[PDB]
RNA sequence: CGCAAGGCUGAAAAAUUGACGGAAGGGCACCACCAGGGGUGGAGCCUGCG
RNA sequence: CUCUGUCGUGCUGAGGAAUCCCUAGUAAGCGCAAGUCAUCAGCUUGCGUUGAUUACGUCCCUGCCCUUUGUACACACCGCCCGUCGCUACUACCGAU
């Protein structure tokens, strides 16, 4: 009951996740590890991979005043900051809700803002380890941060804003395109222009100058058009010359000068790459007189060029390392010490103990590719229906031979012997040739996906389009058997050491175990939220262990059952694109797995609560006369330094405090609640009650509980001495605030009196005959009983 | 018992006498006494 | 909102004329929204509040019966 | 009497109305509080149930 | 049961932890009758007699239900409860074919 652990991983730089950094090191991001190259020699310096998260990362940044700590942001919605001396995550910051996408630092570094594809954008402090706060404008998501402190910032409804950050609210705001969106961020760094980047090709050009009356701090002085109409990916400008670089998602990057807006702005060089560019960066070399522009390109790439100012040349590139368009099929050597590696556009051969190529060729495309046995040569089958022969040691091409006309190779399979290869492409053929010349061919009736022998070399199995599979004998091509029960096509197959089982996965999102005599099948399992792409077993059961199989499946998961049990043993995470192929080894011990990811990996009360906030008020009342009576001796510093509860609700008066916690509670309770309120603090409460008459606010709950409060406590009062002058404060105040609002609203209804008696003259009738019979409002009121 | 317990409360079927209105006879189509 | 609004009105109406509060003619008059209606509807809500206030009054008189009892001892 | 009565097959959803909660406020309860009472449970007899 | 006398505590000992029930002709004590198509004689169901203590409030604890939509109009009051997702329309984005 052995499980299996992700130990190796490689064939991949850059991704298509953003922000590239420049150091003469290139910080890039993998799947979920940031790794850091050298850019003259394509060695990598070092691997920063965090063994608590999975998820992928598609946000750099570094820090100014101090490198060598890093902010990573990942897909969670989790930001880490790395160090470069000691390859760890000292600080994790999980606020976000979702894919951070955009960092950005302080001049001095104490402060990190990330914005987020869930809309907040937040700001860190570093010394506290504390979310600061949390800004929220932006009706769509975020592209664009930067510190002029304050805030600029940028989002996808072609929002520019402006925040403050002593008074977390916004203070300007702009819209950069009407209908389109601001796609990208672009700040000079003396924080006098601004451009922003939107989708159509469009480039608007911002002026910054370095709160009751009319602000106005952007200012849009103008537009201009790139060449390019798709969407600008990034726009970055240089640290210490006047140039800028604009680059869509594409094979172009456009760097612009800086000197209408027409004249301002011109553009200086268009320089073409090789594939779509992801992120371009800046890059200042010591003792050069250029500008080293280094894009990361999608299609698994750096580069690194030289810009002339007062043409573009490729000085340097890091490929070596990884396969550039997508690793489509994978097959380790017998000797499990190298594996081949088929992509669409390349091969590549590679040793697993220092996980690093060693071989390289150019291939068209790549459907299967196949070791023959000796390790010295590879098959390829590729779409356009060849079938090339390469090899390890000349470093060549070999042969190549047209197996099928136009009609991709889809299986290639090495008979166990070893002397024959048997291609099944998407013709209605499959052809077997030994070793090569055409010994035998077989019609089938429909399109062959796949096929594969017997390990004792006894019966062939073939895939179809028919959502079928027909097993035939090897010695002669005769009908064997037929599976069907499969709702869509059959992907892949393989059948055991010992030719008792065979597992079949479909695009029907299932597999089938079948017993391989009489065709019965042991069990149909569902196990994958998407179509299972390639199915292996392992061949050895010299551990006991022959009845294991794996399943490599397009929802990025790999799954690791057992066909005796029928039970899945274990659950291998650790891809995030759809899963191309995968190959077990030829011990077991290990196996590789190659993704959509374009890496490949290696696998080994109300009334106590009514008196305890009077009791708050009137001691916060006594802080507040005293720090009066000081600042009346002298206006010299002393806070009044209340509580921490009102400092904490907003720093709101002890009176809308007590009238907050008066109105809250139903009226019912109000009378039961001042009922249960003792002797002591009606005082605190006739106090409370004359500061409302004073400031008057809700004056029927003021006269409603101050009567309550006479009339359950009558004889007290009369008793007493102290009330008097609280009560002759009262009673003044009261009177004073109903005489107001009296005199008002009858004001109000004398007036309304008058003008309605104005408005039946203007509307009485103009017109004067034998008719007055056209000289009232009705309501229904339906009445059940 | 338990299956057909299981049976209704899925397919739910109960044979619960339904609480009628006291006056369906008078005023069968319910109209509100109020405001009109 | 009741005193908000109705202070808010009597700045309204000490402001401006009756005459012209009555001539006040706006295209978007029709149904409901008609000028009759809505000074209708302020000055029945305004009566309803304005009772509510006289019985207040006439209960805060207490508070001077018991001034002039604490005066009686 | 005829139809029903020919096996891509081999045991373990709907949703613009839906899923699960939280806080406040009520009402009820000798399956709750409160005041007391009484059983069983100690010894022997036995119906019954396991 | 009441009243009247003879005699005087003498293997001649009223039930733990726990758990359950009970609020007015109720608990409890007492006997008499019957044996009713199922059950019940190791008992069952009737019927009469004697008949109290203590609550009869409270949602504080333990729970259960219901409000936050509807179902009616005057006076009068109240005043936009809260979270995590689903589903739907639209918008743009990512990468394989």
């Given at each position: 009951?052995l499980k299996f652990?992700?130990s190796?991983?490689?064939?991949?730089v850059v991704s298509?996740?953003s922000?590239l950094?420049?150091?003469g090191?290139?910080?890039?991001?993998?799947n979920?590890?940031?790794?850091?190259?050298?850019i003259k020699k394509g060695?990598?310096?070092?691997?920063?991979?965090?063994?608590?998260?999975?998820?992928r990362?598609?946000?750099?940044?570094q820090?100014?005043?101090d490198?060598?700590?890093?902010a990573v942001?990942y897909?969670?919605?989790?930001?880490?900051?790395?160090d470069?001396?000691i390859?760890?995550?000292?600080?994790?910051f999980?606020?976000?809700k979702?894919?951070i996408?955009?960092?950005?630092?302080d001049?001095?570094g104490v402060?990190?803002?990330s914005?987020s594809?869930?809309?907040?954008?937040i700001?860190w402090?570093?010394?506290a380890?504390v979310g600061?706060?949390?800004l929220?404008?932006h009706?769509?998501?975020?592209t664009?941060?930067y510190?002029?402190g304050?805030?600029?910032?940028?989002?996808?409804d072609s929002?520019?804003?402006?925040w403050?950050?002593?008074?977390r609210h916004?203070i300007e705001?702009?819209?950069a395109?009407?209908?389109?969106?601001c796609?990208?961020?672009?700040?000079?760094?003396?924080?006098?222009?601004?451009?922003?980047?939107?989708?159509?090709g469009?480039?608007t050009?911002?002026?910054?100058?370095?709160l009751?009356?009319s602000?106005n701090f952007?200012?849009?002085?103008?537009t201009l058009?790139r060449?390019?109409?798709?969407r600008?990916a990034?726009?970055?400008?240089?640290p210490?010359?006047?140039?800028?670089?604009?680059?869509?998602?594409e094979?172009?990057?456009?760097?612009?000068?800086?000197?209408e807006?027409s004249?301002?702005?011109?553009?200086?060089?268009?320089v073409?790459?090789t594939?779509?560019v992801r992120?371009?960066?800046?890059?200042?070399?010591?003792?050069?007189?250029?500008l080293?522009?280094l894009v990361?390109?999608?299609?698994?790439?750096?580069?690194?060029?030289n810009?002339?100012?007062?043409?573009?040349?490729?000085?340097?590139?890091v490929?070596?390392?990884?396969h550039?368009?997508?690793?489509?099929?994978?097959?380790?050597?017998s000797?499990?010490?190298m594996?081949?590696s088929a992509?669409?556009?390349s091969?590549?051969?590679?040793?697993?103990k220092?996980?690093q190529?060693?071989?390289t060729f150019?291939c068209?495309?790549?459907?299967?590719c196949?070791?023959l046995?000796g390790?010295?040569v590879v098959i390829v089958?590729?779409?356009?229906?060849?079938?090339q022969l390469?090899?390890?040691?000349?470093?060549?091409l070999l042969?190549?031979?047209?197996?099928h006309?136009?009609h991709?190779?889809?299986?290639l399979?090495?008979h166990?012997?070893?002397?024959?290869v048997?291609?099944?492409?998407?013709?209605?053929?499959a052809k077997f040739?030994?070793?090569l010349?055409?010994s035998?061919?077989?019609?089938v009736?429909d399109?062959?996906?796949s096929?594969?022998?017997?390990?004792?070399?006894?019966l062939?199995?073939?895939?179809?389009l028919?959502?079928?599979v027909?097993?035939?004998?090897?010695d002669?091509?005769?009908?064997?058997l037929?599976?069907?029960?499969?709702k869509?096509?059959?992907?892949?197959?393989?059948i055991s050491?010992?030719?008792?089982l065979?597992?079949?996965?479909?695009?029907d999102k299932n597999?089938?175990?079948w017993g391989?005599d009489?065709?019965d099948?042991?069990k149909?399992?569902?196990?994958?939220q998407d179509?299972?792409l390639?199915?292996?077993?392992?061949?050895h059961?010299?551990?006991?262990?022959?009845?294991?199989?794996?399943s490599?499946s397009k929802?990025?998961?790999?799954?690791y059952?057992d066909?005796?049990?029928?039970?899945?043993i274990?659950?291998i995470?650790?891809?995030?694109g759809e899963?191309?192929?995968?190959?077990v080894?030829h011990?077991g011990?290990?196996l590789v797995?190659?993704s959509?990811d374009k890496?490949?990996r290696?696998?080994?009360?109300a009334?106590?609560?009514?008196?305890?906030?009077?009791?708050?008020?009137?001691?916060?009342?006594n802080?507040?006369?005293?720090?009066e009576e000081?600042?009346?001796?002298?206006?010299?510093?002393?806070?009044?330094?209340?509580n921490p509860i009102?400092?904490?609700?907003?720093?709101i008066?002890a009176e809308?405090?007590?009238?907050?916690?008066?109105?809250?509670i139903?009226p019912?309770?109000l009378?039961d609640?001042?009922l249960?309120?003792?002797?002591?603090?009606?005082?605190?409460?006739?106090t409370?009650?004359?500061?409302?008459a004073?400031?008057?606010?809700?004056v029927?709950?003021?006269?409603?509980?101050?009567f309550?409060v006479?009339?359950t406590?009558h004889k007290?009062?009369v008793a007493?001495?102290?009330?008097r002058?609280t009560?002759?404060?009262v009673?003044?105040?009261?009177?004073?605030?109903?005489?107001?609002?009296?005199?008002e609203?009858?004001?109000?209804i004398?007036?309304?009196?008058?003008?309605?008696?104005?408005?039946?003259?203007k509307?009485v009738?103009e017109?004067?005959?034998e008719t007055?019979?056209?000289?009232?409002?009705?309501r229904?009121?339906?009445?059940?009983? | 018992?338990?299956?057909?317990?299981?049976?209704?409360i899925?397919?739910?079927?109960?044979?619960?006498?339904?609480?009628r209105?006291?006056?369906?006879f008078?005023?069968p189509?319910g109209?509100?006494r109020?405001?009109? | 909102?009741?005193?908000?609004?109705?202070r808010?009105?009597?700045?309204?109406?000490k402001?401006?004329?009756?005459?012209?509060?009555?001539?006040?003619?706006?295209?978007?008059?029709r149904?409901?929204?008609?000028?009759n209606?809505?000074?209708?509807?302020?000055?029945?809500?305004?009566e309803?509040?304005?009772?509510?206030?006289?019985?207040?009054?006439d209960?805060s008189y207490?508070?001077?019966?018991?001034?002039?009892?604490?005066d009686?001892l």
């Amino acid at each position: 009951y052995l499980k299996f652990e992700p130990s190796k991983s490689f064939g991949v730089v850059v991704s298509s996740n953003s922000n590239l950094v420049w150091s003469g090191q290139a910080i890039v991001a993998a799947n979920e590890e940031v790794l850091v190259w050298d850019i003259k020699k394509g060695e990598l310096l070092s691997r920063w991979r965090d063994e608590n998260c999975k998820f992928r990362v598609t946000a750099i940044a570094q820090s100014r005043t101090d490198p060598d700590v890093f902010a990573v942001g990942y897909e969670d919605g989790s930001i880490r900051l790395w160090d470069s001396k000691i390859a760890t995550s000292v600080v994790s910051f999980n606020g976000h809700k979702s894919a951070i996408t955009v960092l950005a630092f302080d001049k001095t570094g104490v402060r990190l803002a990330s914005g987020s594809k869930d809309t907040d954008i937040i700001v860190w402090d570093l010394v506290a380890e504390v979310g600061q706060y949390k800004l929220r404008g932006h009706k769509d998501q975020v592209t664009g941060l930067y510190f002029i402190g304050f805030l600029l910032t940028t989002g996808k409804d072609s929002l520019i804003k402006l925040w403050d950050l002593s008074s977390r609210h916004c203070i300007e705001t702009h819209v950069a395109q009407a209908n389109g969106e601001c796609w990208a961020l672009g700040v000079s760094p003396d924080f006098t222009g601004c451009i922003t980047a939107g989708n159509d090709g469009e480039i608007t050009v911002w002026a910054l100058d370095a709160l009751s009356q009319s602000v106005n701090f952007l200012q849009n002085r103008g537009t201009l058009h790139r060449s390019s109409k798709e969407r600008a990916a990034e726009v970055v400008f240089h640290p210490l010359r006047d140039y800028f670089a604009v680059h869509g998602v594409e094979k172009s990057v456009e760097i612009w000068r800086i000197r209408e807006v027409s004249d301002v702005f011109v553009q200086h060089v268009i320089v073409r790459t090789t594939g779509k560019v992801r992120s371009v960066d800046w890059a200042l070399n010591p003792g050069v007189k250029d500008l080293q522009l280094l894009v990361g390109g999608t299609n698994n790439l750096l580069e690194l060029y030289n810009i002339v100012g007062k043409d573009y040349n490729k000085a340097l590139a890091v490929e070596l390392p990884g396969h550039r368009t997508d690793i489509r099929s994978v097959a380790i050597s017998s000797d499990d010490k190298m594996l081949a590696s088929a992509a669409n556009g390349s091969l590549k051969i590679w040793n697993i103990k220092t996980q690093q190529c060693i071989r390289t060729f150019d291939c068209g495309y790549a459907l299967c590719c196949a070791f023959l046995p000796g390790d010295k040569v590879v098959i390829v089958g590729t779409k356009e229906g060849e079938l090339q022969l390469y090899d390890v040691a000349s470093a060549s091409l070999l042969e190549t031979v047209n197996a099928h006309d136009g009609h991709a190779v889809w299986a290639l399979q090495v008979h166990p012997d070893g002397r024959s290869v048997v291609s099944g492409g998407a013709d209605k053929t499959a052809k077997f040739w030994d070793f090569l010349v055409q010994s035998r061919i077989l019609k089938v009736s429909d399109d062959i996906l796949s096929l594969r022998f017997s390990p004792d070399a006894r019966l062939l199995a073939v895939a179809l389009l028919d959502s079928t599979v027909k097993v035939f004998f090897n010695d002669t091509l005769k009908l064997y058997l037929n599976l069907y029960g499969h709702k869509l096509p059959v992907l892949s197959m393989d059948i055991s050491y010992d030719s008792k089982l065979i597992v079949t996965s479909s695009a029907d999102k299932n597999i089938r175990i079948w017993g391989l005599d009489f065709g019965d099948c042991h069990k149909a399992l569902f196990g994958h939220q998407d179509s299972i792409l390639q199915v292996a077993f392992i061949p050895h059961n010299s551990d006991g262990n022959g009845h294991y199989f794996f399943s490599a499946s397009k929802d990025r998961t790999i799954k690791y059952w057992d066909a005796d049990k029928f039970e899945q043993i274990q659950r291998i995470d650790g891809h995030h694109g759809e899963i191309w192929a995968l190959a077990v080894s030829h011990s077991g011990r290990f196996l590789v797995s190659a993704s959509h990811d374009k890496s490949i990996r290696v696998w080994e009360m109300a009334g106590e609560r009514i008196a305890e906030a009077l009791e708050l008020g009137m001691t916060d009342l006594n802080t507040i006369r005293e720090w009066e009576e000081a600042r009346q001796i002298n206006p010299n510093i002393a806070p009044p330094q209340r509580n921490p509860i009102f400092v904490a609700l907003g720093n709101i008066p002890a009176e809308t405090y007590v009238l907050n916690t008066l109105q809250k509670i139903k009226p019912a309770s109000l009378h039961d609640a001042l009922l249960v309120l003792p002797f002591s603090t009606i005082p605190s409460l006739l106090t409370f009650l004359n500061l409302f008459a004073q400031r008057e606010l809700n004056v029927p709950l003021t006269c409603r509980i101050l009567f309550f409060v006479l009339k359950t406590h009558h004889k007290q009062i009369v008793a007493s001495r102290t009330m008097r002058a609280t009560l002759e404060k009262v009673r003044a105040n009261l009177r004073a605030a109903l005489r107001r609002q009296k005199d008002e609203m009858g004001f109000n209804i004398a007036a309304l009196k008058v003008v309605s008696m104005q408005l039946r003259d203007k509307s009485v009738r103009e017109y004067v005959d034998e008719t007055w019979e056209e000289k009232v409002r009705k309501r229904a009121f339906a009445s059940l009983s | 018992i338990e299956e057909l317990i299981k049976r209704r409360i899925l397919a739910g079927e109960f044979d619960e006498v339904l609480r009628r209105r006291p006056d369906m006879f008078g005023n069968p189509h319910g109209v509100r006494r109020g405001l009109v | 909102t009741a005193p908000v609004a109705q202070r808010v009105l009597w700045a309204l109406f000490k402001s401006h004329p009756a005459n012209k509060l009555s001539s006040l003619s706006v295209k978007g008059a029709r149904g409901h929204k008609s000028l009759n209606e809505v000074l209708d509807a302020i000055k029945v809500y305004t009566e309803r509040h304005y009772k509510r206030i006289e019985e207040l009054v006439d209960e805060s008189y207490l508070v001077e019966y018991t001034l002039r009892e604490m005066d009686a001892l």
